Amino acid sequence: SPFPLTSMDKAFITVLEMTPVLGTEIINYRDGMGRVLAQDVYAKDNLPPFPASVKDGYAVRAADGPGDRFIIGESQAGEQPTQTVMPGQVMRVTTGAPIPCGADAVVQVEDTELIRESDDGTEELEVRILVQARPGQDIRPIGHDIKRGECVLAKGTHMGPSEIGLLATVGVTEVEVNKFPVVAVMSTGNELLNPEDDLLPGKIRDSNRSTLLATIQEHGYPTINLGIVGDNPDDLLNALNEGISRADVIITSGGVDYLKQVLDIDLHAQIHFGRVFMKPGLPTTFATLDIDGVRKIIFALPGNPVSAVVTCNLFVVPALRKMQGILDPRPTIIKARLSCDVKLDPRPEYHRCILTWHHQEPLPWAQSTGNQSRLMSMRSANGLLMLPPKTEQYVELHKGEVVDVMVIGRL
């Protein structure tokens, strides 16, 4: 120290390389949102499991051709039919109903005309089939959508709603997944007060713990609030021990120098980097600690509030994604057009922005937060602008030029 400056590329790769993948556990399928499957999932039945009608109509023998037919009955959703359709008969079907024995096609109701109904008008008796059915027409055969024994979801699948629905479909209600990381957050600094406190001299309200907790929660991971910790070895070492004991990940912000000393000397953690050649984020620190053959990760983020949130999105979120089993945990980076000119720094530079798609324009505009219309000054950040380092060729970027933006919010 001052620790060597690490490049942004090496810092990032080092985070992903060194972060572990959590172990697995069995969950109920309804809790599967955002989880990664740690098993292949197979169907144990056919979908549909019976030949099913695609249409409201009549189940027929295609060989009978067009003509006048006795309706022997009705097949409806949820009931197995007990009658066999013989030559010159048909059975009424609704969409999804099983096809009875002896019928090999369905003619939709619009290709028919009813001849006779019961006196009370509740019951159709005879119908004119107006078309020549193709065999198997308007029937979903057994197993058309899913076959028994088929693998419907592969291990490594990152599950959303449709995958939860596929589990339900196949009746696989308990599944093996990766664990979610438990994330403990503390703040440090003698100047900090709880949000709930009135100001005292020399002090400000701690906002990072709140912003960082919210960031992590927005991604779905459980969190632990470790509060404000006195910026001294004794309280830092204890907070850090309580974090290590309670969580997979510990994030601190502030005091980055007692912090880096406790990690190395008192905790015996390997600090992989302590300064990053980036803007903002220069003092960011990443360390791992192996105890139990369990690897803990520790992020010591800058105290400055803008820096704490940018660094959390660049480093922490991808690490958590890896921990929870996502095979490629890297963030989504899209192309956008700058809304304003911008001088480049020699450091790679990151800034919160709002992404907006205008009428029939293929690229969204990226508007840097804090400088704003009314409605635009009100909007929440959904991107992180990723500005290139200054060069001899590129010293300045202009409104309208094409830039990289990391997606950090719902679009």
Binding site: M8, D9, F12, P348, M386, P389, Y394, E401, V403, D404
Partner: peptide, 10 residues
Amino acid sequence: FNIVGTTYPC
């Protein structure tokens, strides 16, 4: 994919 912003070749 690069964590460090690039400029646009086109």
